[PDB]
C-alpha cells in the first residue's frame, strides 16, 4: 500500500548517481564509466521490478496515482540505455544523462506527492 515512502528514496538516490555519471561523462573518464554505467542501468533495472510489485500491493487510488506514470518512464529509459551502449558512438552521451537526471528530477516530486 505505502511502497512509495521507499520508491522516494531509490528517485533521490537515482539523481545522486546521475549527477556523479554526468562529471565522469564530461571528462571523458571511460575507464571509470566500464564500471560505473552498470549503477545508473540498476537504478533503472531495480525500478520496473520494484514498481511493478509495488502496482500489485496497491490498495489505496491515491497512493497508486503516479506508480503507472512513473514506470513508463523507467521502461523508455532502460532501453534507452542499451542503444546508448551498442550503437559504437558516445559523441552525444552526456546530454543524455543529463536528459534522464532531469527526468529523476520530475520523478522524485511526483512519488512523494500522495506520500
Ligand atoms: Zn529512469
Ligand atoms: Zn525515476
Known sequence: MDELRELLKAEQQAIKIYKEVLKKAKEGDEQELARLIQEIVKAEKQAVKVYKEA???????????????????????????????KQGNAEQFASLVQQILQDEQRHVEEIEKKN
Open 55 to 85: 502496482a500489485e500491493k496497491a490498495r489505496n487510488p491515491e497512493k497508486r496515482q503516479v506508480i503507472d506514470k512513473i514506470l513508463e518512464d523507467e521502461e523508455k529509459h532502460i532501453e534507452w540505455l542499451k542503444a546508448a551502449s
